[PDB]
Structure formats: C-alpha cells, structure tokens
C-alpha cells in the first residue's frame, strides 16, 4: 500500500483514488482528482498555479523551519595504526613531542 502523489499539484493519492494517465511516450501521470487532471490537460504550468507544491517550493513559501539549524555531529578519536606493523609499538613511539 503506497500513497502516491499528484504529478501536477503534488498531493498524496491514497489507495483507489483519482485517475492515472499513461501517455504515449509511456510516461505516467497520476492526478488526485479531476481538477489537477484537467488543469493538466489544459497545458497549465504548475509553477504558475498558486496552490501547488511545485509552485510553492519554487516561490519559497511557508518553509521557515527547514531553513532552520539542526544538531547532528559526532566526536571520534580512536586508533588502529597499520596492518602488518605492530599496533602496540605505534602509540608508544606515537608519544610525539610538540
């Protein structure tokens, strides 16, 4: 069970919903409802039709908290040395100086 989305508007297409359009070039278009789907056949350009996902995304609308910082980073610092040359004698001689 997959929710699909509207290849014109961008809205989730819950099971058994709307209309699916297999075009001549074999590219499929799923429309949630006949509004997008006719707006589609009318050769309308979704980046011009306000209420769509694509129009918004492109017009920087409402996003606010995705352009907000997060907090994901670690701190490692562990040692393995080199395979074939005693991993013991590579932290004693690794006592460094400056």
């Amino acid at each position: 069970m997959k929710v699909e989305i509207d290849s014109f508007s961008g809205a989730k297409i819950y099971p058994g919903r709307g209309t699916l359009f297999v075009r001549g070039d074999s590219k499929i278009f799923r429309f949630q409802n006949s509004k997008s789907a006719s707006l589609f056949k009318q050769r309308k350009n979704p980046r011009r039709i306000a209420w769509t996902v694509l129009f918004r995304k492109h017009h920087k609308k409402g996003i606010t908290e995705e352009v907000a910082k997060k907090r994901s980073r670690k701190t490692v610092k562990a040692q393995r040395p080199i395979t074939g040359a005693s991993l013991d004698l590579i932290k004693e001689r690794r006592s460094l100086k400056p």
Binding site: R80, P81, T83, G84, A85, L96, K97
Partner: protein, 170 residues
C-alpha cells in the same frame, strides 16, 4: 530488507536482516543523510543513531544522494559521479539510478553509525579492525605523529613484518 551497517570509528561492518513491516517502516520516506534513532528498529539497537548512507533496491540498482524521489530515474552520468565509472576519455553514459528516498523496494539499506547505543553490537563494537596503510608522504608522517620539521622522519615510518617461513622481513 537487509541493513548494511558500518562502524566507522572502529572500521567494522556487518549486515542484519529485518522482517516486520513496522520495524522497517521507520526508514520509509527518510532520505540519505537523515539520522534514525534505533529503538524503533530493535532493542539491541536501542540508542544507536544511524545516518543513512546509500544502498540498493531489488534488481540491484544503487541509490544516489541528491535525487529526491522514491523511484528510479534514468540519468546522464559523468566522470566524478556516483554509480558511474567511465570507460573512456569524456565518456558519458545514460544509466538507471534509484532515489535517495528509502522505500520497501530496497533489498539493502546502507547505514553508518553516528552514536552508540546503551548496548554493544557484536561484530561492530566488540571487534576493531586496523587501518591498512600508514603515512607515506613526508609531512603526513609529521602530522600523524606531531614532530616539528626537526625530529627527522626516517625512523617514524611504519615497518610491516612478514615471514619467508624462517626469514621474517621488514
């Protein structure tokens, strides 16, 4: 599906096989680079935070960070790109690619550990595996060791033993 988890602090790796929809479904609609908390996936992994790194669907096609889409798309790839190794000078090829968005169409989700859980995982935090090759360029030795352009390298290089049987060589 299968999880290919890497432990990159220890350089350890191991797979795990997870049936049960709700257990998996924690990865769904997550993208490459999104971190996942671990108790959702199991109770061994309780705590462990996984950043999602790559992985292949059935039929074997690879993922590709930066595509979006939970589908496959056929792309033009070049030198200096993932899932493409060019056979010839300035050779581009048009190849299928799977999206960075996990779905249940995957056989293997590639995961990199970022934070350890309250419990050890056996083939990952129990076992530690060495870095194969050590510093070779001049200054790099001086930085793996911290030596000042004084201490003279020569003797700070690594020396890998191996035996002729009765002759053990350096």
């Amino acid at each position: 599906m299968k999880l290919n988890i890497s432990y990159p602090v220890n350089g350890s790796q191991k797979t795990f096989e997870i049936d049960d929809e709700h257990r998996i479904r924690v990865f769904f609609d997550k993208r490459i680079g999104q971190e996942v908390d671990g108790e959702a996936v199991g109770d061994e992994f309780k705590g462990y935070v996984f950043k999602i790194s790559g992985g292949n669907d059935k039929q074997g096609f690879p993922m590709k960070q930066g595509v979006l889409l939970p589908t496959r798309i056929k792309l033009l790839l070049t030198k200096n790109v993932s899932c493409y190794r060019p056979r010839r000078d300035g050779e581009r090829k048009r190849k299928s690619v799977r999206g960075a968005i996990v779905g249940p169409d995957l056989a293997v989700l590639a995961l990199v550990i970022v934070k350890k859980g309250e419990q050890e995982l056996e083939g990952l935090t129990d076992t530690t595996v060495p870095k194969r090759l050590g510093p070779k360029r001049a200054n790099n030795i001086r930085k793996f060791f911290g030596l000042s352009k004084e201490d003279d390298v020569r003797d700070f290089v690594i020396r890998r033993e191996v035996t002729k049987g009765e002759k053990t060589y350096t």
